Amino acid sequence: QCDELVHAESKSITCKSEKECSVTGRALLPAVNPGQEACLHFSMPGSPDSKCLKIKVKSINLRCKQASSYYVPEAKARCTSVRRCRWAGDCQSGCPTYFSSNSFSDDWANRMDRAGLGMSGCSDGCGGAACGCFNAAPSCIFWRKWVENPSNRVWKVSPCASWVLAAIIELTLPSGEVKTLEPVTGQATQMFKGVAITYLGSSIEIVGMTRLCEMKEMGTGIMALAPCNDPGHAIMGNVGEIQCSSIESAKHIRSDGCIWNADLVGIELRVDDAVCFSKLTSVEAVANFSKIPAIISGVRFDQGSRIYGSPLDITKVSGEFSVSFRGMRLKLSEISASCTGEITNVSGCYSCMTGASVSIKLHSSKNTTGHLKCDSDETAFSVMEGTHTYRPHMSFDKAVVDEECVLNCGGHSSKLLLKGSLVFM
Amino acid sequence: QCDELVHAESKSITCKSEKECSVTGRALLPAVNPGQEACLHFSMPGSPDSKCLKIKVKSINLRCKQASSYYVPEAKARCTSVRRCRWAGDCQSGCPTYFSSNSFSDDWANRMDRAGLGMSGCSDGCGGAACGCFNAAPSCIFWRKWVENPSNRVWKVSPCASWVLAAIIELTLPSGEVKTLEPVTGQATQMFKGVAITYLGSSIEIVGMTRLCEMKEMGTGIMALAPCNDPGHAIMGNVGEIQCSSIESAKHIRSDGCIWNADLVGIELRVDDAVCFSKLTSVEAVANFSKIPAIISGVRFDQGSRIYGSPLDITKVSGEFSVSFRGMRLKLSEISASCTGEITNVSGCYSCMTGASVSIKLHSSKNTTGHLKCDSDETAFSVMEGTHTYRPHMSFDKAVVDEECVLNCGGHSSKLLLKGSLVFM
Amino acid sequence: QCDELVHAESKSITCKSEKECSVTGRALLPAVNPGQEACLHFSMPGSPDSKCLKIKVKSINLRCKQASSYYVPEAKARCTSVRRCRWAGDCQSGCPTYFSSNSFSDDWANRMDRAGLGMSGCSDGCGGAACGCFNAAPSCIFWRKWVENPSNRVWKVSPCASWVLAAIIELTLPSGEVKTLEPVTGQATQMFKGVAITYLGSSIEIVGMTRLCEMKEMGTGIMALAPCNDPGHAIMGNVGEIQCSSIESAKHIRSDGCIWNADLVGIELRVDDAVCFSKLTSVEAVANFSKIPAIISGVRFDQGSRIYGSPLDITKVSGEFSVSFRGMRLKLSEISASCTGEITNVSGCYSCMTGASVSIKLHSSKNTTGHLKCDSDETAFSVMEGTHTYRPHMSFDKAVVDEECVLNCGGHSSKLLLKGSLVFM
Ligand SMILES: *[C@@H]1O[C@H](CO[C@@H]2O[C@@H](C)[C@@H](O)[C@@H](O)[C@@H]2O)[C@@H](O[C@@H]2O[C@H](CO)[C@@H](O)[C@H](O)[C@H]2NC(C)=O)[C@H](O[C@@H]2O[C@@H](C)[C@@H](O)[C@@H](O)[C@@H]2O)[C@H]1NC(C)=O
Ligand SMILES: *[C@@H]1O[C@H](CO[C@@H]2O[C@@H](C)[C@@H](O)[C@@H](O)[C@@H]2O)[C@@H](O[C@@H]2O[C@H](CO)[C@@H](O)[C@H](O)[C@H]2NC(C)=O)[C@H](O[C@@H]2O[C@@H](C)[C@@H](O)[C@@H](O)[C@@H]2O)[C@H]1NC(C)=O
Ligand SMILES: *[C@@H]1O[C@H](CO[C@@H]2O[C@@H](C)[C@@H](O)[C@@H](O)[C@@H]2O)[C@@H](O[C@@H]2O[C@H](CO)[C@@H](O)[C@H](O)[C@H]2NC(C)=O)[C@H](O[C@@H]2O[C@@H](C)[C@@H](O)[C@@H](O)[C@@H]2O)[C@H]1NC(C)=O
């Protein structure tokens, strides 16, 4: 493959603890993008020459570092009321003073788990013969609005407080052994006689991503990745507008284990009934729409029960290596790529998080990186030797695509035309 | 200009595919801040010496990577009601069972686009002669609260799911040709005989920026950058508390194309009228306050119809280059700057996103970077040769500014005094 | 200490302004993690050899770059009402038209700061003898719901719009002088005869952190770090659901200096009283739970009255240096560490922002970096020579810990067993 990646080569004197000093060769690879691979040939002065040491970055991924978790139900709004004339039942003298948001009337008809999350009260109703009462003073309306979880469906929700880079590299030793591993950052690792490699860290050009949260439906394990509320903040209109501290608490939305804002349910008292209004957000609908694998604005998120993100523009992440070699000379194998191509389609949505699909047929003499810069967006992707079609996603702002793009594949540049039609949503 | 920027210079043997091996000179520039420029002199063994290759970073900017878009109206709250005695009109037997949140009474007086977003209902009202009715049973109050867009003003809102770095570099070839371009990351670009340059990527020291969204007023194109709701989440108190899927849907806030939380409008039924309460957030007021260009906490945001951010502290972003040279010797031109200065003013706000303005008159023998570290904040900016006044922004926490600051300009350090007075908001 | 950190060493020709050209030695340290230290020995051709120049990264921290600030009260909900028969008091002809959300009834009993934030109104009540009135037409209910701050407790809230890296380095000159400083990024600093050092910047592998806000209780100075609302957006369920523009405005929640959503307080009118509902979020409770120092998902936040964050995985931040040396030879002192250890405990919470505590006893021949990779999480920490116990935090997803972990300490790897039990919350 033989990418040009070694950008410094040095000979330093290194000493242990009199003193024991010797010459160390060192080769610095400041920036290696996913898919790229270097080929390093070591020969001792006596020689011949080894097959090369190959150093490839397979991927540099984003791992979710979680905030505290909580559980959410698929909640449904319910309301009930019963009216008692003054001097009847509890209404001996108007609304009884104790009857408050945790109170339950025995006169109630509907589903009343007395342990469920909700809000009760009692209100004045009309009295007199006109409203079916002997006593003309106001009647009592004992009412409750609450939420239940009839489907027993529950999601564990874990906000991603940040994402952390995690590299996977692939090394081919001159013996031919292939090693695929997450390296230990900053620790020189002896690979074979006289040669050690240090992974010096990963870097990313993507700043301040939007807050996303892992969702896992319990007892089905199916995952989603979507916005959610901070733990303990029951803000209406989001996953997490109801939050529970256990699976069972969420299954039955228990008052003692769940929080909410009671305005999620509206109740309208009428003389002889009540009208219920749901302002609830369907958790199920959000998870349906947000299933993994998903492309969200330049990053593909996928599941291993942990979620990781892969930047789609592979030139926006890189890893750095240092190679030391003792008593050996280094030669680099470096070759340019012959690569040409044409766009065969653009299709999809505009002003959408997925971005449109750009279909690009390329022929390439070796594995390399394709770059596509348009006026709306720009991206890069790995290209395989031979002739193949690639479908990177790119973001456009309008239904009509008709613009100049520049394709750069292995240093060869051409001005392609992108034309197509895209939908909203 | 001649900044010290080449921090490694090497001579490696590079080979193609027997084998064809030759010596490649390589120069690594690990970190170049905006405004900085290197000067590289190449001479062949026979010589004289070329004018230099100049490599300057013009800017490293943040480009908005959008989430899905939506449209928002400048919404205004409306309410209406009509009361019908029992046995009159629809109220033949109390509130009719069908009359619900999408129902419209023909008895209504006010603006009723039956396609608009809103919520209807009917409620019991007082009956009898005391409330103007023959029948003593409860009357019916048919009511609706809704939102309209009388100004027809609409903004397209595009949340920025993340920001991505984008570099602009300026190269001066020994021939004197100046090239200003966004380079292709990771691809060696042949510049002139024997010399190629690779841009190895950009890096930024600013972590996890606050969520901002592009706003564009339709039919005026004027832009703003401000917080907003995630698409599909109609959280009250934010741009995006009402969201529409098209311009026309937003112009007339259509029920079929818009979402909201109906608690954005309050209605109070009285016997013979209703009181309307608006809890709406003015979109216009947010966009007014959030016009581009804007400084938001260390980053200047500006328009090209796309928005980009420029870190104001120019030492917090950098680009990395590698230069290869074949059959040539390299010499670096590097000069230090003579530079002194004094603070002439500090004015503005404290505890504000803009930060205060610090006025600094500097004299400098060459283009260089000024650094100002204070106890409250710290920044750096590009400085031009000659005598000029600069106005970097810095953040303070109190109305009274009276503190030690250190000014570093081209390696020369001095302890300046910052004194001034600032306002809240 | 003698870490392997110099990964390039070069000899370039550098020229001033005929021309004055000379040879400059340069040593590049691409990536130095906190706790690591290099030892550089300079000898002039005549020699002996200096004690070394030591270059250590003490810390690379995250500094909060603030949005605009605001003040929040510890708010408490209040309600009052008074009912006047028709033809009595203001109720001469029903609810008076002027009586609206800023109106105050002189008939009111409760705490009425007429300058406080709140919402008034008047509503129809029942008339006639049945409701204590001679006139049978509807009575008037004059009511108000508002918020007060009885404790006078106020927090200044400053959202962190982003976090910026700030490095502290420690240099030991051959003379033995120790210098601890924040370096000036990108400026070559002359250290001693012939030697200068450039700090080339900091880098971090943590992307897009969750929005946090500094909180400072006024008149106590005690700090917290917690989510909050954007300035000017009074979204219910968060710190900042009530926002004030001054300390005094927050102390008494003045209408002219504070904003809110009036649905934070509910009022239910009954015939002869009103029921008050608080939907307020206790600011005090959030600050209590969010006190500094706090570990939030991989970062320890601590106070200097400014807050800074320290990444706990020290291999996820690094600094870069360049050293120039004039007329001298360089030798590197580099030694590997002997280091072994065992896990002695894991205790704490799962699916929590703190993460569990893993207790690790290590013996090490020198200061070095310990790395612990488990299936749930992975971290690294600084290790001191000798035998010591370390307690890095790691995130697990389940109450039962029983998994393979790999410990890497100075290049020595061992597969440890992690077993323990953790709680939710
Ligand atoms: C050339 O690239 C192939 C990989 O293509 C995949 O798509 C690329 C565009 C990019 O996305 C890359 O990340 C992908 O891996 C390599 O072959 C594949 O290697 C994977 C191992 O992960 C293996 O599962 C596939 O079967 C294999 N063949 C395919 C996809 O047709 C080539 O890798 C070399 O050749 C392979 C046969 C194997 O020996 C591998 O270890 C070698 O690196 C790439 N060519 C070269 C010369 O590297
Ligand atoms: C010295 O810097 C000038 C630029 O000043 C601007 O402000 C700086 C403090 C910093 O913000 C920088 O980003 C700005 O560009 C250069 O001159 C300007 O170059 C721009 C090109 O972008 C041009 O539009 C201006 O007319 C020009 N003159 C000004 C602003 O007075 C100097 O650049 C060199 O000289 C120019 C005449 C041009 O030949 C340019 O290509 C050269 O780089 C800077 N001096 C040197 C020696 O580089
Ligand atoms: C070995 O590390 C000691 C520091 O340990 C602390 O914990 C580490 C695991 C890591 O978290 C690190 O950041 C911490 O500083 C050093 O000694 C300490 O140095 C600090 C100065 O910040 C000082 O306050 C302590 O008293 C001191 N001794 C302790 C904690 O026992 C060693 O530093 C060297 O030796 C010191 C005596 C001092 O001369 C210092 O300047 C030296 O660097 C570290 N050893 C070596 C050889 O560097």
XYZ file of N, CA, C and O in Angstrom, chain B residues 91-191:
404
model
N -75.496 23.069 22.145
C -75.617 22.716 23.559
C -76.953 22.063 23.876
O -77.577 22.365 24.907
N -77.399 21.171 22.994
C -78.723 20.581 23.164
C -78.823 19.793 24.461
O -79.910 19.709 25.041
N -77.708 19.259 24.955
C -77.742 18.390 26.129
C -76.434 18.486 26.913
O -75.952 17.491 27.460
N -75.868 19.692 27.006
C -74.532 19.880 27.545
C -73.507 19.918 26.423
O -73.842 20.001 25.239
N -72.236 19.893 26.801
C -71.179 19.916 25.795
C -71.332 18.705 24.881
O -71.462 17.578 25.369
N -71.360 18.888 23.565
C -71.479 17.723 22.695
C -70.213 16.889 22.727
O -69.090 17.407 22.752
N -70.411 15.568 22.730
C -69.304 14.653 22.950
C -68.212 14.817 21.893
O -67.027 14.706 22.208
N -68.580 15.102 20.646
C -67.565 15.193 19.602
C -66.681 16.441 19.729
O -65.650 16.517 19.071
N -67.083 17.453 20.495
C -66.404 18.737 20.399
C -65.115 18.643 21.181
O -65.137 18.584 22.418
N -63.997 18.692 20.474
C -62.709 18.326 21.047
C -61.660 19.267 20.463
O -61.982 20.344 19.950
N -60.376 18.886 20.534
C -59.350 19.914 20.358
C -59.244 20.397 18.926
O -58.684 21.477 18.697
N -59.790 19.651 17.958
C -59.759 20.078 16.562
C -61.105 20.594 16.085
O -61.310 20.748 14.876
N -62.029 20.846 16.996
C -63.378 21.231 16.618
C -63.490 22.747 16.500
O -62.856 23.505 17.239
N -64.342 23.186 15.590
C -64.584 24.602 15.379
C -66.073 24.885 15.522
O -66.902 24.171 14.960
N -66.412 25.898 16.309
C -67.792 26.353 16.403
C -68.065 27.388 15.315
O -67.292 28.337 15.145
N -69.166 27.197 14.584
C -69.657 28.225 13.672
C -70.065 29.498 14.405
O -70.176 30.555 13.779
N -70.312 29.427 15.708
C -70.725 30.620 16.430
C -69.568 31.570 16.708
O -69.792 32.643 17.278
N -68.345 31.213 16.323
C -67.182 31.977 16.745
C -67.004 33.253 15.929
O -67.255 33.283 14.719
N -66.510 34.289 16.603
C -66.348 35.619 16.033
C -64.962 35.860 15.446
O -64.849 36.441 14.362
N -63.905 35.429 16.135
C -62.553 35.893 15.851
C -61.967 35.197 14.618
O -62.628 34.408 13.933
N -60.697 35.516 14.333
C -59.924 34.936 13.237
C -59.865 33.427 13.346
O -59.084 32.923 14.154
N -60.604 32.675 12.539
C -60.472 31.223 12.635
C -60.128 30.620 11.281
O -61.002 30.170 10.534
N -58.831 30.632 10.974
C -58.262 29.692 10.023
C -58.448 28.292 10.601
O -57.790 27.916 11.584
N -59.359 27.518 10.008
C -59.609 26.166 10.483
C -58.438 25.234 10.229
O -58.481 24.074 10.659
N -57.417 25.697 9.522
C -56.218 24.912 9.288
C -55.084 25.279 10.247
O -54.018 24.643 10.214
N -55.293 26.270 11.109
C -54.230 26.724 11.972
C -53.982 25.805 13.147
O -54.840 25.025 13.563
N -52.773 25.929 13.691
C -52.387 25.205 14.891
C -53.082 25.792 16.121
O -53.077 27.013 16.329
N -53.637 24.932 16.964
C -54.317 25.416 18.147
C -55.066 24.298 18.844
O -54.932 23.114 18.499
N -55.853 24.696 19.842
C -56.571 23.716 20.649
C -57.932 24.270 21.040
O -58.031 25.356 21.628
N -58.977 23.515 20.697
C -60.352 23.862 21.023
C -60.850 23.016 22.184
O -60.233 22.008 22.569
N -62.005 23.410 22.722
C -62.697 22.520 23.636
C -64.041 23.111 23.995
O -64.401 24.197 23.536
N -64.809 22.380 24.816
C -65.945 23.070 25.398
C -66.096 22.669 26.850
O -65.754 21.554 27.265
N -66.595 23.629 27.607
C -66.558 23.637 29.050
C -67.948 24.003 29.507
O -68.732 24.571 28.746
N -68.261 23.631 30.736
C -69.523 24.030 31.329
C -69.442 25.488 31.759
O -68.406 25.950 32.230
N -70.524 26.231 31.519
C -70.671 27.583 32.007
C -71.909 27.651 32.894
O -72.706 26.711 32.951
N -72.067 28.768 33.586
C -73.214 28.886 34.479
C -74.494 29.068 33.679
O -74.499 29.667 32.607
N -75.584 28.508 34.194
C -76.882 28.612 33.579
C -77.803 29.532 34.354
O -77.383 30.287 35.231
N -79.083 29.477 33.993
C -80.090 30.211 34.730
C -80.128 31.696 34.410
O -79.271 32.259 33.722
N -81.186 32.337 34.918
C -81.403 33.760 34.684
C -80.200 34.587 35.115
O -79.868 35.590 34.475
N -79.555 34.194 36.214
C -78.394 34.928 36.707
C -77.305 35.037 35.650
O -76.555 36.018 35.639
N -77.206 34.049 34.756
C -76.243 34.066 33.660
C -76.932 34.175 32.299
O -76.404 33.711 31.286
N -78.119 34.776 32.258
C -78.743 35.096 30.988
C -79.376 33.941 30.253
O -79.555 34.019 29.032
N -79.728 32.865 30.949
C -80.253 31.675 30.301
C -81.574 31.296 30.941
O -81.721 31.388 32.158
N -82.529 30.862 30.119
C -83.783 30.354 30.659
C -83.565 29.051 31.407
O -84.028 28.891 32.541
N -82.900 28.093 30.769
C -82.639 26.800 31.385
C -81.583 26.941 32.484
O -80.513 27.521 32.265
N -81.860 26.359 33.651
C -80.989 26.548 34.799
C -79.792 25.616 34.783
O -78.848 25.846 35.541
N -79.813 24.567 33.954
C -78.668 23.667 33.845
C -77.468 24.402 33.248
O -77.607 25.498 32.689
N -76.269 23.835 33.383
C -75.068 24.527 32.888
C -75.127 24.811 31.387
O -75.636 24.008 30.603
N -74.625 25.984 31.002
C -74.480 26.348 29.601
C -73.211 25.707 29.039
O -72.461 25.030 29.749
N -72.962 25.917 27.747
C -71.769 25.421 27.075
C -70.877 26.594 26.690
O -71.362 27.577 26.132
N -69.582 26.486 26.949
C -68.620 27.471 26.470
C -67.732 26.792 25.443
O -66.917 25.929 25.783
N -67.911 27.147 24.180
C -67.067 26.635 23.105
C -65.903 27.598 22.926
O -66.128 28.789 22.686
N -64.672 27.098 23.024
C -63.519 27.995 23.059
C -62.375 27.435 22.231
O -62.288 26.231 21.977
N -61.470 28.328 21.831
C -60.231 27.896 21.215
C -59.105 28.874 21.550
O -59.301 30.094 21.552
N -57.919 28.329 21.794
C -56.687 29.106 21.846
C -55.783 28.631 20.721
O -55.673 27.424 20.471
N -55.150 29.572 20.025
C -54.331 29.198 18.881
C -53.222 30.224 18.677
O -53.101 31.201 19.421
N -52.384 29.980 17.674
C -51.301 30.896 17.331
C -51.444 31.255 15.869
O -51.784 30.406 15.041
N -51.196 32.513 15.554
C -51.144 32.929 14.171
C -49.849 33.692 13.945
O -49.134 34.053 14.893
N -49.562 33.926 12.662
C -48.357 34.603 12.191
C -48.784 35.798 11.342
O -48.671 35.763 10.106
N -49.253 36.883 11.971
C -49.747 38.026 11.179
C -48.687 38.677 10.309
O -49.026 39.178 9.232
N -47.413 38.685 10.728
C -46.385 39.331 9.920
C -45.900 38.462 8.766
O -45.204 38.981 7.889
N -46.257 37.174 8.733
C -45.805 36.208 7.728
C -44.297 35.997 7.758
O -43.745 35.380 6.850
N -43.628 36.476 8.797
C -42.188 36.319 8.925
C -41.831 34.917 9.391
O -42.474 34.373 10.298
N -40.822 34.325 8.744
C -40.419 32.936 8.938
C -38.901 32.877 8.965
O -38.240 33.527 8.153
N -38.342 32.082 9.876
C -36.918 31.793 9.874
C -36.683 30.313 9.603
O -37.349 29.448 10.182
N -35.729 30.023 8.733
C -35.166 28.682 8.677
C -34.146 28.536 9.798
O -33.272 29.386 9.959
N -34.271 27.468 10.570
C -33.446 27.217 11.745
C -32.696 25.923 11.474
O -33.316 24.890 11.186
N -31.371 25.968 11.553
C -30.568 24.765 11.342
C -29.606 24.601 12.508
O -28.577 25.295 12.561
N -29.921 23.733 13.465
C -29.004 23.505 14.580
C -27.644 23.077 14.039
O -27.555 22.401 13.008
N -26.582 23.510 14.714
C -25.238 23.060 14.364
C -24.921 21.852 15.241
O -24.643 21.996 16.432
N -25.006 20.649 14.665
C -24.734 19.437 15.437
C -23.278 19.360 15.882
O -22.982 18.800 16.947
N -22.364 19.911 15.088
C -20.977 20.077 15.496
C -20.342 21.081 14.559
O -20.929 21.487 13.548
N -19.146 21.496 14.915
C -18.356 22.378 14.082
C -17.105 21.624 13.660
O -16.558 20.834 14.437
N -16.687 21.826 12.416
C -15.557 21.116 11.838
C -14.520 22.152 11.424
O -14.879 23.229 10.940
N -13.245 21.847 11.651
C -12.189 22.790 11.303
C -12.008 22.816 9.794
O -12.128 21.790 9.118
N -11.687 23.998 9.269
C -11.391 24.182 7.852
C -10.304 25.239 7.743
O -10.470 26.355 8.246
N -9.208 24.879 7.090
C -8.012 25.701 7.026
C -7.966 26.454 5.709
O -8.371 25.933 4.668
N -7.465 27.681 5.760
C -7.073 28.407 4.569
C -5.602 28.763 4.710
O -5.191 29.374 5.712
N -4.808 28.364 3.724
C -3.375 28.611 3.733
C -3.045 29.492 2.550
O -3.814 29.594 1.592
N -1.893 30.153 2.643
C -1.388 31.013 1.585
C 0.053 30.614 1.347
O 0.855 30.595 2.282
N 0.363 30.249 0.114
C 1.695 29.817 -0.265
C 2.261 30.816 -1.261
O 1.549 31.281 -2.156
N 3.526 31.168 -1.087
C 4.227 31.999 -2.058
C 5.359 31.148 -2.605
O 6.263 30.758 -1.857
N 5.295 30.834 -3.897
C 6.347 30.048 -4.518
C 7.540 30.940 -4.834
O 7.401 32.163 -4.928
N 8.736 30.354 -4.971
C 9.922 31.169 -5.293
C 9.745 32.035 -6.532
O 10.305 33.133 -6.605
N 8.939 31.584 -7.487
C 8.559 32.402 -8.626
C 7.797 33.659 -8.228
O 7.609 34.536 -9.070
N 7.302 33.751 -6.992
C 6.457 34.861 -6.608
C 4.964 34.628 -6.739
O 4.188 35.500 -6.334
N 4.529 33.493 -7.289
C 3.098 33.218 -7.369
C 2.524 32.975 -5.969
O 3.058 32.181 -5.184
N 1.436 33.662 -5.659
C 0.726 33.507 -4.397
C -0.477 32.617 -4.642
O -1.228 32.840 -5.592
N -0.656 31.605 -3.799
C -1.772 30.683 -3.923
C -2.494 30.657 -2.591
O -1.884 30.365 -1.557
N -3.777 30.963 -2.612
C -4.602 30.936 -1.413
C -5.626 29.831 -1.596
O -6.360 29.828 -2.590
N -5.657 28.877 -0.668
C -6.478 27.704 -0.913
C -6.766 26.983 0.393
O -6.048 27.122 1.394
N -7.846 26.234 0.372
C -8.036 25.200 1.367
C -7.292 23.968 0.887
O -7.601 23.461 -0.190
N -6.290 23.491 1.614
C -5.528 22.334 1.147
C -6.314 21.045 1.331
O -7.302 20.985 2.058
N -5.841 20.012 0.645
C -6.387 18.666 0.744
C -5.609 17.937 1.837
O -4.440 17.597 1.649
N -6.254 17.682 2.969
C -5.543 17.093 4.099
C -4.941 15.741 3.735
O -5.616 14.876 3.176
N -3.652 15.570 4.036
C -3.017 14.282 3.904
C -2.530 13.941 2.507
O -1.964 12.859 2.314
N -2.706 14.819 1.526
C -2.254 14.525 0.167
C -1.081 15.421 -0.194
O -1.212 16.652 -0.182
N 0.062 14.799 -0.497
C 1.242 15.510 -0.960
C 0.925 16.214 -2.269
O 0.414 15.593 -3.207
N 1.176 17.524 -2.321
C 0.848 18.311 -3.504
C 2.141 18.864 -4.086
O 2.878 19.587 -3.405
N 2.434 18.495 -5.323
C 3.649 18.978 -5.968
C 3.504 20.462 -6.261
O 2.560 20.862 -6.941
N 4.457 21.271 -5.798
C 4.365 22.730 -5.890
C 5.232 23.314 -6.995
O 4.776 24.162 -7.759
